[PDB]
Amino acid sequence: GIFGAIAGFIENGWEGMVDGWYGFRHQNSEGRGQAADLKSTQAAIDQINGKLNRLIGKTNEKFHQIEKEFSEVEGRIQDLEKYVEDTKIDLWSYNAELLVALENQHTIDLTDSEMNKLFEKTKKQLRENAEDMGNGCFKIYHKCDNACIGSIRNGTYDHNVYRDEALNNRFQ
Amino acid sequence: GIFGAIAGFIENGWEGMVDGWYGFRHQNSEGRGQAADLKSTQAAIDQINGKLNRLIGKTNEKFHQIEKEFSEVEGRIQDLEKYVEDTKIDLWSYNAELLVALENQHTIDLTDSEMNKLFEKTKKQLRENAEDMGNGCFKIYHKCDNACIGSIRNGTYDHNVYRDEALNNRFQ
Amino acid sequence: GIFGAIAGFIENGWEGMVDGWYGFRHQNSEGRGQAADLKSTQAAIDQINGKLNRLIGKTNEKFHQIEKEFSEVEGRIQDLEKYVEDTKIDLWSYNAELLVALENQHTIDLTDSEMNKLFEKTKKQLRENAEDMGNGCFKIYHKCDNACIGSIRNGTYDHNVYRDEALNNRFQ
Amino acid sequence: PGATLCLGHHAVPNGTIVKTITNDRIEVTNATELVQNSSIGEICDSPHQILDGENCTLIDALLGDPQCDGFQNKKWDLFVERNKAYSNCYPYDVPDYASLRSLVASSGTLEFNNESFNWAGVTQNGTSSSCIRGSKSSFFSRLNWLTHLNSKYPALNVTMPNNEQFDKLYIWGVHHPGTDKDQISLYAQSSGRITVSTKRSQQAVIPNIGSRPRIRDIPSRISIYWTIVKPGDILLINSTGNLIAPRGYFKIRSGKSSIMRSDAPIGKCKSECITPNGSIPNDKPFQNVNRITYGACPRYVKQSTLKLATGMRNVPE
Amino acid sequence: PGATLCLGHHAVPNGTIVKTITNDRIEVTNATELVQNSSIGEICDSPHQILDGENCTLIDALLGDPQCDGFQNKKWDLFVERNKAYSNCYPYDVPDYASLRSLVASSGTLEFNNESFNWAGVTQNGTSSSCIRGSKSSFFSRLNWLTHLNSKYPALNVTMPNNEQFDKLYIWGVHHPGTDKDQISLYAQSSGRITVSTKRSQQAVIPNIGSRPRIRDIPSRISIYWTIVKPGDILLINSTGNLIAPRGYFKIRSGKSSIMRSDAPIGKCKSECITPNGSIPNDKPFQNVNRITYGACPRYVKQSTLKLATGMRNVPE
Amino acid sequence: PGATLCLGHHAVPNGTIVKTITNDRIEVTNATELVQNSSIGEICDSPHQILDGENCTLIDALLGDPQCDGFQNKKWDLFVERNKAYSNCYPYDVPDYASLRSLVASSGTLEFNNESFNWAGVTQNGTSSSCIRGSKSSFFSRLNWLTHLNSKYPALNVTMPNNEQFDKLYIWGVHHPGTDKDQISLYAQSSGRITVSTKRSQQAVIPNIGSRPRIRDIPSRISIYWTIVKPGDILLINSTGNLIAPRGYFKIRSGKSSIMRSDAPIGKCKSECITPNGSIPNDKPFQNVNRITYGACPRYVKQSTLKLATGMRNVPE
Ligand SMILES: CC(=O)N[C@@H]1[C@@H](O)[C@H](O[C@@H]2O[C@H](CO)[C@H](O)[C@H](O[C@@H]3O[C@H](CO)[C@@H](O[C@@H]4O[C@H](CO[C@]5(C(=O)O)C[C@H](O)[C@@H](NC(C)=O)[C@H]([C@H](O)[C@H](O)CO)O5)[C@H](O)[C@H](O)[C@H]4O)[C@H](O)[C@H]3NC(C)=O)[C@H]2O)[C@@H](CO)O[C@H]1O
Ligand SMILES: CC(=O)N[C@@H]1[C@@H](O)[C@H](O[C@@H]2O[C@H](CO)[C@H](O)[C@H](O[C@@H]3O[C@H](CO)[C@@H](O[C@@H]4O[C@H](CO[C@]5(C(=O)O)C[C@H](O)[C@@H](NC(C)=O)[C@H]([C@H](O)[C@H](O)CO)O5)[C@H](O)[C@H](O)[C@H]4O)[C@H](O)[C@H]3NC(C)=O)[C@H]2O)[C@@H](CO)O[C@H]1O
Ligand SMILES: CC(=O)N[C@@H]1[C@@H](O)[C@H](O[C@@H]2O[C@H](CO)[C@H](O)[C@H](O[C@@H]3O[C@H](CO)[C@@H](O[C@@H]4O[C@H](CO[C@]5(C(=O)O)C[C@H](O)[C@@H](NC(C)=O)[C@H]([C@H](O)[C@H](O)CO)O5)[C@H](O)[C@H](O)[C@H]4O)[C@H](O)[C@H]3NC(C)=O)[C@H]2O)[C@@H](CO)O[C@H]1O
Ligand SMILES: *[C@@H]1O[C@H](CO)[C@@H](O[C@@H]2O[C@H](CO)[C@@H](O[C@@H]3O[C@H](CO[C@H]4O[C@H](CO)[C@@H](O)[C@H](O)[C@@H]4O)[C@@H](O)[C@H](O[C@H]4O[C@H](CO)[C@@H](O)[C@H](O)[C@@H]4O)[C@@H]3O)[C@H](O)[C@H]2NC(C)=O)[C@H](O)[C@H]1NC(C)=O
Ligand SMILES: *[C@@H]1O[C@H](CO)[C@@H](O[C@@H]2O[C@H](CO)[C@@H](O[C@@H]3O[C@H](CO[C@H]4O[C@H](CO)[C@@H](O)[C@H](O)[C@@H]4O)[C@@H](O)[C@H](O[C@H]4O[C@H](CO)[C@@H](O)[C@H](O)[C@@H]4O)[C@@H]3O)[C@H](O)[C@H]2NC(C)=O)[C@H](O)[C@H]1NC(C)=O
Ligand SMILES: *[C@@H]1O[C@H](CO)[C@@H](O[C@@H]2O[C@H](CO)[C@@H](O[C@@H]3O[C@H](CO[C@H]4O[C@H](CO)[C@@H](O)[C@H](O)[C@@H]4O)[C@@H](O)[C@H](O[C@H]4O[C@H](CO)[C@@H](O)[C@H](O)[C@@H]4O)[C@@H]3O)[C@H](O)[C@H]2NC(C)=O)[C@H](O)[C@H]1NC(C)=O
Ligand SMILES: *[C@@H]1O[C@H](CO)[C@@H](O[C@@H]2O[C@H](CO)[C@@H](O[C@@H]3O[C@H](CO)[C@@H](O)[C@H](O)[C@@H]3O)[C@H](O)[C@H]2NC(C)=O)[C@H](O)[C@H]1NC(C)=O
Ligand SMILES: *[C@@H]1O[C@H](CO)[C@@H](O[C@@H]2O[C@H](CO)[C@@H](O[C@@H]3O[C@H](CO)[C@@H](O)[C@H](O)[C@@H]3O)[C@H](O)[C@H]2NC(C)=O)[C@H](O)[C@H]1NC(C)=O
Ligand SMILES: *[C@@H]1O[C@H](CO)[C@@H](O[C@@H]2O[C@H](CO)[C@@H](O[C@@H]3O[C@H](CO)[C@@H](O)[C@H](O)[C@@H]3O)[C@H](O)[C@H]2NC(C)=O)[C@H](O)[C@H]1NC(C)=O
Ligand SMILES: *[C@@H]1O[C@H](CO)[C@@H](O)[C@H](O)[C@H]1NC(C)=O
Ligand SMILES: *[C@@H]1O[C@H](CO)[C@@H](O)[C@H](O)[C@H]1NC(C)=O
Ligand SMILES: *[C@@H]1O[C@H](CO)[C@@H](O)[C@H](O)[C@H]1NC(C)=O
Ligand SMILES: *[C@@H]1O[C@H](CO)[C@@H](O)[C@H](O)[C@H]1NC(C)=O
């Protein structure tokens, strides 16, 4: 991925997370748990559904056309009819090949981006109370119970509440 | 956006900024103000103008071609003439649709990138004298008058001048 | 570049580095040196080779087709044969032009991304022992001899060994 | 002690390989197929009005081959021409056969209106044992084989004005006798002329006498021609022998009708897209079933499969 | 107290909706239209040399229809053929009419050089009341209607060598009399032959006698043919009746000339791109005005609008 | 003192300019050319079986022009037709010449099987001084010029059944005498008829008498026609004069064979892609050498160069 998160500084995915595409795993004093992040999951799904919406169920109507199979040798005109159809099929086959390759590259990059976005969002939320371990995990330098973890996942974490405790543990 | 700045950690744009695409808003002891960043604005405009330069005013010359409207029923040859033109129009309509969709996606991402670039550039400039609040705003932990703000916008800010004052305010 | 590293916060490339695409330059107590990073170099080369693999040596076989040069004026049928071929050539010329422009834009962005990835990887490795100077260089706040520099390049740098020394030098 | 907060993404045990710009084989959590590669094996009779030609080609249904009498005045969105179809009337050919078949198929109708031509002085309704209808010698239902009366073939000069608001399609022919003996026997003179004209067009045909290989014991041949008469114009037939006369005109329309060669059976189902292999679903944008299609159809491509990634890269364990 | 430094981007109160790969409706600060959907309603007479055919088709200007005498020896980049144009001379047709019209339009010139053929023994300059020029019975200006002299039509055998450095285009014809009486009246024998040949080509036509519906009281018809003579080759005309002779040759050139059917008026303006609707600007890469174009034109597409984003995403308030 | 650790990338002193979506001129460390713009100037004789026509067109090799006797029964993947080729036998033309040349070139073989036709009552093996073979007057090797015997041309009515498992291609012709004197001299009657038919097709030709410009002192002309006979069908030839008879049939096949006009010499080398300019390498996906190609070839484009970046942006010093 072009952002370096998925298959990057995040070592691997979680087969155990089945209610979301992105999420949090925590270990604190009350145990260890898992929770999916709905907003980032929805953001990736909406973009992929936007791709599907303009590729699926959008066929054009064609009716009377040219003949494309021939039982007799005819020469010039039949050569042109065959050449016209072979030309068209090759150009559409090229369109289809390029389309899928471009879309898949973009899909991998956009899902990698959503993972990086959630990581950056969480990092800025923690301010001076945590340090990036480099593998997608934050070392939080204060007691952070389940309500505290839930406040980070909900976006309501107030870093000033724990700042004095965290700075003391960080900078010994 | 794939970088998460525009319509991302930056809540909304500034309708009040009319001399640039990207810029700074500050509040200090001398008041609050606004200033556009010319280099990042120019970088985004140059790339979009590069797109326009190869799409606008680049038409090909065609002269004598095939007939495309018919008043009489003729059969085989007319079927082929109509099929050739319908094939061509569909392929060019596909080209035009895909072109605009790809370019617009890239334009949104490149303008999002230029916003992220300016944010990262400013962040590194401030070193240990400021903290990212997470909404595109920096909390600067020292007295920073208009000349001090102007030095950040000009790229001449010397972090060592204020480091002792900032570290003292940051780490109480 | 869309990530802002190459031709961005990295001022220029190193003509003196001929064994890799990305690498490290250091100055410490034992001197100053240079070393290429193989993994990031290989990552960029593998992606470009993936592009070349589906563009080079993949031609289709065509045999008997239509005539494309004419010595006599014939009228309707010759008009169609010429129009069919001119239509095909224009669509393939468009395909080739768009293909190269898209691939080159992606190649510049992916090589810029690999540079940014290596920078971010090194930054997280240093934890609180170094500061980003903003030009792709880290100021390391502890004595870091050649073995210490080599541990950073190898990914085996233990930040806890130097943390007390670094924090003392950083926060005077 | 503090806490650890780890950011991550999901993964699946059953990934799917897709292609990208940089990699021909990369595994994502999920994908969807963009190339339809199967048909249900039958042509659904909805929503397009299907006409199964059975043993009849469209041209044979047009001329009035005896096995095609059930097709009189029928209409269709898609005429399905079976590969088993065969002719069983007087031996004939159509110069530019493909164009007549195309324009009738595109018109989508075999509506025929009888007209009373003034064939004064000749014998009408000639028949042949090569064209049996009801155990008797007969002929194309829409054509009138004119021959001599009392060993006289007086010159024909007949008009038929088009006072309608639509175009008329006239099907007529020229009989090529096998021998000069047959030419005398049928038309009482050594050589015929046929001139069919309007204010906009003229068609002149001379019969070509000679032995052709026998079909149902007939060494002669008929050549089929057609003429379109615009409103306010007039059909003028001027002949001194060998004329296979029309019995009226066909309505010629414009619309979405066509013809398809297929051996697939007709089924009672609904499908927008028809191929000679049968109907195919049209949810996917591409298909590799058949380059011949009718209706709202995916575009034919050479690839048998194209997987569109619908999830992130799969990074297990 | 410190300070706060906020990074941001602009926004506008009047955004524009565009499409992307992931969204069919997303608002950006500004966009530009890539599909030209309007014309000024007139064909600009610069920079292409326009020839307004008015009441004359190109073929009628070629043959010399009396209302087309002002078009003699004219040249054009684009010949504009009006839908009101009508023929007003002897009734004629052109086998492969579309090809003759195409090759003359592509040649871009009606330059005609008279040549003196040796029509020894026949009457020249036949006329008809169906082709009035100056209140008198006349004929196509570039064609020579030959008839009998003293009830004799001696066989014609005439040559015309091409000693020029360019190709010659010869227009000639065959008269199809309405009756055998007319055939005798005009050519003094029961059947004509016409053979027009060079060292590279041969054309042989037999007249077809028969009544056609009358146009300006004429039941006869002329069929128009053409022959190209290369430098160093020779035109050989060999006929025993019914020959509509050429009066010379047309220069046939190669270049950028063409023909367009249009009813739009000609205006005094400048525009590179011409459509039957009128001239259109060519700044945009695509257009949905007309699939028929001439000049430096945007490419025809089915879409009526395609908005190219020229600014960032618009995020107001 | 600490240490400084700088991250960076390489650069080169000799960059290459490429195009992107946003920039027409941007310098990268390296690029590769995607448009082949050169040929080696010769057509490699491997891996495709090349047949150098030399002085012979394919049609002249088909009919049996004396300078083409070495081409009898030859086969080819690509027939190379030289622009210097010229005919040197009886003057002839082929209606739809391009189609006969196309179907024979696509068939890829001149295998010819002699058949014994029963030309009872006529003189065979007519010759002409316009077609010299071995310093004697001769004729097309695959054609049989039939003329009168004892001033009698009895009507011909000959059959030749196709009892093989493949299609037969028959080449025959019609002689157009220059004068009525020649018609009597050759065929002992004033007008000929030719009818060539099968159970599926019929072809009838009438000779057209008239003077054509002389080629090798011959004012007459032959017109070449062809007929394909399916297995189980029969060829029937029915003529009373002017028949240029076939001596047998050609095998007609399906495959990858074709024909190309070129003056490039044949070389002893290997190359999948052939153009009239000569063989070109096919490593690149596009080429601007020639729109005419044969084999595994890059696609023709209008651009003379397209540089694909294979390295990062070059940022020196
Ligand atoms: C007073 C007097 O002397 N008057 C003279 C007349 O007698 C004379 O008429 C001719 O008389 C001879 C007598 O020997 C003969 O009967 C002529 O009739 C033809 O005969 C041949 C030989 O049998 C026959 O050929 C056979 O045809 C069949 C097929 O037959 C049909 C069919 O297709 O079913 C019969 C149809 O009625 C007929 N259609 C029409 C509209 O008449 C067609 C048609 O003739 C063919 O399809 C055209 O090819 O044929 C089969 O093909 C056998 O293989 C074949 O041998 C002809 O069919 C008979 N012709 C007719 C019209 O019936 C008879 O004309 C007259 C002229 O000679 O002169 C008077 O003075
Ligand atoms: C000594 C002796 O006896 N000599 C004999 C000759 O007399 C004889 O000549 C024929 O004589 C009869 C006498 O009754 C008659 O006049 C013949 O002339 C034709 O007459 C018919 C009947 O009126 C006429 O048909 C009418 O044609 C007009 C249109 O007229 C023009 C036109 O288009 O304007 C007149 C043009 O001059 C003419 N063009 C040329 C080059 O001659 C054309 C052309 O004939 C037609 O366009 C061809 O279709 O016609 C209108 O169409 C009316 O509706 C129609 O009734 C013919 O036009 C007259 N033909 C001519 C050539 O003028 C006259 O030939 C001779 C042969 O019978 O035998 C001698 O022994
Ligand atoms: C007892 C009695 O009286 N019987 C009568 C016969 O005599 C008579 O036959 C005719 O007799 C006259 C006598 O003056 C004459 O010889 C006729 O022969 C033709 O003569 C002309 C004039 O020279 C000649 O034209 C020249 O042809 C050459 C080319 O010659 C060839 C060639 O192409 O090489 C010769 C070939 O053999 C011939 N091919 C065949 C298959 O016969 C071809 C062919 O004829 C042409 O290619 C067709 O265009 O020609 C050159 O073109 C000169 O420029 C040209 O002047 C003809 O070629 C001679 N024709 C033949 C067949 O040889 C002779 O027929 C008979 C009929 O009048 O009536 C009896 O009662
Ligand atoms: C130019 O040359 C062609 C070719 O020779 C001639 O055309 C042939 O004409 C003859 C009649 O003259 C045709 O012969 C007929 O064939 C029919 C089909 O024969 C096949 O089928 C039967 C069984 O149905 C087999 O026994 C036979 O072996 C074949 O396999 C027969 O049904 C006919 O028989 C009937 O008529 C004859 C004749 O009166 C009676 O004796 C019989 O008892 C029976 O009633 C007949 O044999 C032949 O088919 C034609 N061939 C082609 C290819 O068309 C042309 O006539 C000639 N042109 C001129 C002007 O002469
Ligand atoms: C094969 O059959 C066709 C069709 O019947 C014949 O062609 C017709 O020939 C007749 C003449 O024989 C033509 O009749 C002429 O029609 C002209 C146009 O008539 C219309 O316009 C007039 C007013 O201008 C109306 O009054 C009339 O009702 C029509 O609406 C008339 O102008 C002619 O009149 C002049 O000539 C006659 C005859 O001499 C004089 O009596 C008159 O006073 C006047 O001077 C004339 O009536 C008819 O138009 C032809 N029809 C077609 C479709 O072409 C062929 O002749 C026939 N073939 C053979 C060989 O016989
Ligand atoms: C319809 O009209 C055409 C055109 O006039 C006639 O066709 C011409 O017919 C004559 C014969 O009647 C042909 O004349 C022959 O030309 C040959 C080529 O001449 C060129 O080359 C020679 C040198 O080889 C030069 O001297 C000459 O100037 C030319 O440049 C000559 O080789 C012939 O000469 C031989 O025959 C004559 C006649 O017997 C002898 O006197 C000579 O000694 C010599 O043996 C001859 O001159 C002419 O080429 C034809 N022209 C065309 C264009 O085909 C038709 O005949 C006529 N139709 C009818 C039915 O009459
Ligand atoms: C189109 O129809 C017209 C009229 O029906 C045909 O004209 C007619 O042609 C016949 C000949 O086929 C003429 O009969 C002749 O009668 C005279 C009597 O003197 C005689 O000399 C001839 O031997 C022949 O028997 C008839 O008079 C004539 N009618 C008219 C009004 O001219 C015409 O032939 C038809 N054209 C075609 C191509 O069928
Ligand atoms: C091409 O032109 C040539 C020459 O001009 C034509 O040849 C000529 O044809 C006529 C017949 O149409 C011949 O006249 C005949 O005269 C004899 C006298 O004995 C007589 O028996 C016939 O009834 C007829 O009147 C003439 O002699 C002849 N000339 C030559 C030199 O052969 C030829 O017919 C033209 N071809 C075409 C297709 O128009
Ligand atoms: C196809 O071949 C057949 C048979 O070979 C041809 O039929 C034959 O045609 C000739 C006329 O060209 C007939 O000869 C005639 O003989 C009578 C004797 O009474 C006489 O009146 C005539 O003047 C002529 O000499 C011959 O009888 C006839 N044979 C048969 C069996 O009918 C036919 O002409 C050929 N068709 C073509 C288009 O070449
Ligand atoms: C995979 O994607 C397709 C297309 O959106 C969807 O129908 C299918 O349910 C997806 N599979 C899973 C397991 O979500
Ligand atoms: C459809 O029919 C064509 C023609 O017979 C055949 O080549 C193709 O394999 C068929 N495809 C399927 C999916 O049945
Ligand atoms: C241009 O003319 C065509 C043909 O009449 C018509 O269909 C189309 O609507 C016209 N477009 C404009 C913009 O006038
Ligand atoms: C190839 O031949 C064509 C036709 O003569 C010519 O236009 C073109 O310039 C040639 N190209 C090369 C590379 O020789």
Author numbering:
A (entry chain B), B (entry chain B), C (entry chain B): 1 to 172
D (entry chain A), E (entry chain A), F (entry chain A): 9 to 325
Copied sentences from the primary study:
IAV strains are named according to the antigenic similarity or serotype of two major viral surface glycoproteins, hemagglutinin (HA or H) and neuraminidase (NA or N), which also play key roles in binding and release, respectively, from receptors on airway epithelial cells. Influenza HAs bind sialic acid (N-Acetylneuraminic acid, NeuAc) containing glycans (sialoglycans) on cell surface glycoproteins and glycolipids as their primary biological receptors. Previously, we and others have demonstrated that over time, IAV HAs within the human H3 subtype have evolved more complex receptor specificity, selecting for elongated α2–6 sialoglycans featuring at least three linear LacNAc (galactose linked β1–4 to N-acetylglucosamine, Galβ1–4GlcNAc) repeats beneath the terminal species-defining sialoside moiety. By utilizing a variety of structural techniques, we provide evidence that this enhanced mode of receptor-binding has evolved over many years to include mutations outside the traditionally defined sialic acid receptor-binding site (RBS).
Surprisingly, considering their extremely high sequence similarity to contemporary clade 3C.2a counterparts, a panel of six 3C.3a recombinant HAs and whole virus samples from isolates spanning five years from 2013 through 2017 all showed minimal selectivity for extended human-type sialoside receptors present on glycan microarrays, with widespread recovery of binding to glycans containing n=2 LacNAc repeats. However, the observation that 3C.3a-descended strains, which bind both short and extended receptors, possess only very few mutations relative to clade 3C.2a contemporary viruses or 3C.3 progenitors (which maintain selection for elongated α2–6 sialoside structures) has provided an opportunity to gain valuable insights into receptor-length preferences. Surprisingly, only one HA1 amino acid, position 159, stood out as a feature that correlated well with both the loss of to binding short receptors in post-pandemic strains, and reversion to binding short receptors in clade 3C.3a. Comparison of complex structures between Ecu/16 and Tex/17, respective representatives of clades 3C.3a and 3C.2a, reveals a potential role for residue 159 occupying a space in close proximity to the reducing end of the 6SLN2 receptor fragment above the RBS. As described, when present as S159, H3 viruses bind similarly to both long and short receptors; however, when present as the alternate commonly observed variants Y159 or F159, the otherwise closely similar HAs bind preferentially to elongated glycans. Analysis of the Ecu/16 (S159) structure reveals that the smaller serine side chain creates substantial additional space at the top of the HA head domain, allowing free rotation of the reducing-end GlcNAc (compare the turquoise receptor in Fig. 5G and S5).
